[model samples]
Target: GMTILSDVKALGQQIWLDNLSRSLVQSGELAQMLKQGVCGVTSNPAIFQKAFAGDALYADEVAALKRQNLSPKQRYETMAVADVRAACDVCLAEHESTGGKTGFVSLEVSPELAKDAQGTVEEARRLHAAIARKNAMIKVPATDAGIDALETLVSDGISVNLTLLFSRAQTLKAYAAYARGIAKRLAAGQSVAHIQVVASFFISRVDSALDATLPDRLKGKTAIALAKAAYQDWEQYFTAPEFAALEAQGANRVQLLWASTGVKNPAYPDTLYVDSLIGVHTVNTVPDATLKAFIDHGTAKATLTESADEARARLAEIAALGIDVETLAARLQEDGLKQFEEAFEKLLAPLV
Candidate 1:
């Protein structure tokens, strides 16, 4: 009956599929999931690697691409762009019905450009133009370079999914960059109304990085706390007096998208991240397994803002344990990029 998914949707949190493949869109399953309240899609090299390696639908395309004499990167982009464009079309009606507020599909730029702001901007623009869909968001990592590129991309009227955020610190910087972008667009008399942005925080990874050293009481708590803390930053920035004018002029709040949400620890509940982080004006990009788990028995509520004080204190507790979250966040961000880089390497290795 899609009760749980609908319930989460009713609370104003958007559920986005964190995976995509040719078969998903062509076989009609992606559209079916969209009907069940999944309003968006997010893809990465890792996801693409998995999908391409597992789905035979890509074999024929790979065979053809092998004969094209294109670079491995070019071939990968060609296939990735096509799939993302297809996904964008699948979510287009939802995008239109929502007046461009939701129903987006994110396609990330190459991991190799994570450290190149100008390169990232150019690639993001190219990807956005290639996809040519209003609901297509070019995903960029939340590296310093990437953050530097956000304002330009946003002002250029491109939607962005700012990913690889592992801490409140990173998430806040992303929000600030996004706000500056919207301000720039407004100053230039451009339409900021239709542009969408999502600062993607890799959720479960925070716990995975910290739990080994955390006491039992603090284990499995950092990620949700970090997210809730960042939501405070969201409320502060978007609702602050400085942004009042921007909001009145049609700038949408850059919603936070929870990523890396599939739990890493077997001791935790399968739906741990999904159920724990539900809130209004946010998104949870769930993998297939976690999505299914939630559909079967997940409880949806406004859990994100529930422990306002507790979330803060929880982070304090983690700090008190002598763990440096800032250092850990930096490492986690790099590790995430490497994971994607490796996946991309694998994804392209077989192409050429």
Candidate 2:
């Protein structure tokens, strides 16, 4: 079927809209997108800033909240949490349709908490309750602190969207942490089918960082190769008895969420990430431009499940050439957070 998205979704992959706004949710556009088979939504600081910048939908809230004399951050939360709740309601059908595996709206804690494990845990719990939706997910970074908080939050039965992962090492830590969290829930005789874990492995940024040193042929290829390697890591690690046992308790080990899916380089195909990353048990959160481009021209293919051995070999070759993927991964995570923190600051600058 030229109907690429539906087929991919039927095969167990979920396509999520990466941007959200008060307008989109209120105008029923978000709901329409969900009906169109977009199973989820995600909101970050930059997205909120963008939505607030131009949408008329936020005007009433902005002026009213402005009168409250709230801090920029508090004002930001009031708006964000409300939108998240609306998004959760919009996707409720899909959430229940997948038995809690699909329909989800992700709201991230402040970037400032990236390194504070306890702070992150406290904030994550607070945000989850604040949103108060069965389909809401609190996003946490993949930093060491975030990983620590993430494992605890999961054990406490809150769904997580683990963001900013950049390498096999980072993603592996996420999987390990997830396993322990699921184990605790199961030990307490809890059902984990409602708990969703999305490992948001970044694309595009890898090449944007490493492409300079790579040969022309190797340039722009690392992101996909590294992603395939991490997917392999999932198959190996989750297939272990420990994870299999969790499946017996109605749990999904985790799904790989392809983030930073939009291409930064115009020379790349607009649908580069969406067209390439399709597979079972995964999610790709794309911007509206990319989603439209894909629906018009995208084709569904299980390209991710292909090239397993070669992807591994390719990664090893990159390693031999002195580009330590894991070390570079850490640098990317730091760089990733720095950029987002700046985005957060810029976003909050106008708050009254």
Candidate 3:
């Protein structure tokens, strides 16, 4: 049977699990999903906090690490690094199959240092080396500091998952920084061919934030609208002459990844973001619920390419209502940062 996941991959898009756990790696399910066409995996502090707290998958390891007189933060890092390494090994097949385009595992740096550009840059380099897996992608937020660090990381040839992007401003900056990285690598005589980046443009949360204030007609339309327009940005910036130059040296696609695809509001369809944002050279990471929802009853198509003009008009309608997309993006990134810090603090707390 043609499943929604396989169907989507056939259209030139990749699906990734917006999750990670020791259980997935141990149970063989991670590899199973990879064979089913889920080519990658991503993780955040929230996901880790939940996974660690929900079970005893790491209890023995945690106790041993804690006994080594490690601080709470060290304990967390040791555990996360190991977990991510496990995922990287599990995804090695898909990664090798795609020649480093797919089958990657992402590990986020500490959110507390999100505003520290040098810290992010240094830590990303450290994690990339620590994980020591060719398929490891160091995830960073799309904050100002993150953008700076990302350029340096990619210039050093580290794969990146640029996360928490919600508006056009960050989207523009993400691609620009991505190209800057590739260009710098080429200048440095570093190989840019296998270097890949995925700009994780957030959805669902955009509508969740604005739905309360928007009219019924505009409630659910803002996110898809932003996404389609962002795809146009991808078409423009990633295809610039400079990118073609980088590609000549083997630069990979600057893929637009759809993050936070699971619906938060009960009123919206469960798979709202996943179904609407399908397009070529893109990635979508969904939680277990959203993945199951799509696999069970979702329609897979090239919706992202279908309504580019309509998407622009939808954002235009929002702009006419006095909502500045860029400003909204900055505010959302701020709020998103706060949420991550809170989740991270908890994740690093003593397990007891």
Candidate 4:
């Protein structure tokens, strides 16, 4: 009851680890963290690249995969799938106990497929099958192409994490895609209850993109304000009468997940994103450093829905200042994709 993280969970938000690797799982560090109220784990090319390069645990597996005649990406996936599967098992108890609402571990599709809808769908299917776990989620970007893949994957009953979202507009598209996919499954009389979806809206990147253009008083305020406004949109949209019928049929509302939660600026508090974004029906996936920072001395509360009107005015102020949020959002998404693509390229080379 005295723990900050458990207190956050009691307030109805879930904390998920943003980094995953063999050492974390095999050494029981992941399990230890879970006991501290971390409900999920998410991995991407950068996280995997960091894990592979730094951890000696992958050496034998990397050497073994080298002789198996697989491509570099395949080798990377081989290691990733194994570690993710292990993580899924570690989180399985939490998944089942919550009836699949929590305890998920995500594996992203190759960033190279970010613009290739069909390739994304095909790879998501293959990767999900390879991981072979009930709690595994295939992460796809919310690019127009990736949204197409997301709908198809959900219609096919594959769980997904819709990533790279930067604005309420992007999150709206993701919500519609998720609902349409659930509707299609229900139309086909398929089970929608077992499917899971999380829309990952990045946090720090917003300020990292817009702060220099903003005055000092408004410097660190935009990201949290944007998130709060988006959270309001999420709450109203999911609870609308249109979604009520789907909710009755056991469809899960696509949960809003705060990604890129680590503070990008030294002047901002290290737990800025995590401390400010906690609320019911949301998740914040943090890097190990950020997670530790919060555990040590971060404040937690239902701060997400706080200052509802002011959050909107903050955006209006930015608009008045002639800084276009939509244009910046597009650029942020493009830069985010490029970072992942480059990480994938580098992460695969070591496997070779």
Candidate 5:
């Protein structure tokens, strides 16, 4: 069986582990994955919530924090930051080795602040400063508030992984925000070389939301269609004359990062998303099962993006069938916020 991590790299796509925990770091498994070409890690409340539940590795730390009279949220942040720092260390060589092009780990701010623009920015700065690692990218959701936070964070020279994007419109808005951020930074005479941002377009969840609403023929195609359209937009935006000026001023382009790529439907090939979305300057964060399956029998190619015209046509066709694409996208965002909130609550419950 091939390791998922290896297959991802073989395809010229960066494989970021979508989960993290203190045990993973303490056991040195994270380091092992890093050596296996795992470029980075992404952690959210949901991931850490699972991590805290499965192992007693964090129990002692939690106890210590409790003894210090820290609140439960503080305890969680303390534990999370430690792992974030360790993950950064494990990937540090890659960070240096790649000239800071890859090997960054992400830590998200509280999900409760998803709708608060200023709060998101404040927390992003706090988390970024607290992690204090050059390769640490602060993760912010792709809400309206998150869009504002993204631009602010990027302008400040902080790296970002903008998450939970489910539509082409959201992706385009994110790119515009990124462009504005870079432009502001250049206007202020700031060095934009080390800044990095990835528009995290989620995959499987898109299909999950749309699957039940469409005809059998259209059930599994929404996610790919969305991805393709978004990629087309990325291609257009990144190479535009305006963005070219930013590039000349040392601004970093916001690359697309495929999140939630693990297949949810058993009927679909486990490696379908991974194999289908390979291209340069793009990333795919995979769960262990999907990652492993790809390693064993997965095909790799440079099929990063093609067929935008077909994708757009299919999307329009789906809409013609009475699927309110815009409304569905908004519904997904609201649902996503609830999911993250629940995940955060679960993570906090144990500590509380």
Candidate 6:
């Protein structure tokens, strides 16, 4: 299954491992995956908090760091930095071989900084520098402050994986920030060739949030509709004269990454998110289970471009059903932040 997934990467779409753990890195699983075509990695507070709770791989480091009087957050950082560095090394060759087009790993700053623009910028810089790998990207939430931080970080030449985007609006905001940042870099005579950014618009979670409000006919359609709309926005942005100028200045375009792609609702086809979103220059970060499902039964086609008018119409139909898509997206961002904070708190409880 892993080999088959690697083949998918060879076909031009990058497969990023959606979950990360110190155990995965230290046990050589992450390295092995890289050989199998997994070119990128993504981690969040929730992933690391769970990794710290269940994995013995970080126990010694946690204990040693504790003895040195590091706070719980710092302890988490210490462990995460190690895993990110290890994973970066695993992907470094891919990064170079692709001429910096692929093979990037992501580490998010604290979820607590989701709403604080200045703090997010500072922490994104600190985290990116702390990892000290060219393949490393700071994952910033697509919050208002996060968008600001993304612009600042990218302007400073940091690669970014903008995470937790849930709507066309949020995705567009991220792209705007990315464009401005790259333009700033070009204006300042900075090299924009190697700076990579992905606007991680989430799938599945859209249905999870809107299923209650949606009619039976509309259930499970929100994610696909939103995804299609997001891609359309990407198409438009990259073709614009403004973005064309940035590209002329050597700024790499921000790819649209499909994230939170695992199907939560069992009634829908398991590979709905994966099969529907494939295109060149984009990424689908999948969990192991979803990756295997794709290997087994997934068919890849350029479904993203087909049915463009209907996709937009479906989104409008949902909005007419009294589902304020934009408001729900904002709520999801806030909810996602709280969930991560709670997970971090739970992980810290064991230490206290």
Q: Pick the candidate with the highest lDDT.
A: 4
How far is each candidate from the true structure, as Cα RMSD in Å? Answer: 1.0, 1.4, 1.3, 1.1, 1.6, 1.5
Q: Candidate 2, residues 281-308: lDDT per residue as tens digits?
A: 8999999888888898877888887887
Model 2, residue 223: distance off in Å is 0.4
**What are the per-residue Cα lDDT tens digits for candidate 1 across 1-352?**
3778888888989999999999999999989888879899999999999998999899899989988879999999999999999999999999999899889999999999999999999999999999999999999999999999997899899999999987777777887888898988888888988999999988888888778878989999988888889888888888898778788989988898899899899999999998888889999999998899988888888999997899999989888888888888899999999999999999888987
CA shift of 296, model 6, Å: 1.9
lDDT of 2: 0.88
Better of 3 and 6 by lDDT: 3
Q: For model 1, where is the 10-residue window of minimal lDDT?
A: 166-175
Which regions in candidate 3 have their CA more than 4 angstroms from the true location? none
After TM-score superposition, what is the CA distance of residue 102 in candidate 4 from its true location, in Å?
0.7
Off by over 4 Å in 5: 1-11
User: TM-score for model 5?
Assistant: 0.96
Cα lDDT of candidate 5 equals 0.86
TM-score of each: 0.98, 0.97, 0.97, 0.98, 0.96, 0.96
Clashing pairs in 6: none
Candidate 1 residue runs with Cα over 4 Å from true position: none
Q: How many collisions per candidate?
A: 0, 0, 1, 0, 3, 0
Clashing pairs in 5: 2-295, 2-296, 4-291
Model 2 scores a TM of 0.97
Tens digits of per-residue lDDT for model 5, 229-284? 78878888899998999898787788899999999999899988988888777898
Global lDDT of model 3? 0.87
Better of 2 and 5 by lDDT: 2
lDDT of 4 by residue, 210-245 (tens): 788788778999989989999999989999998988
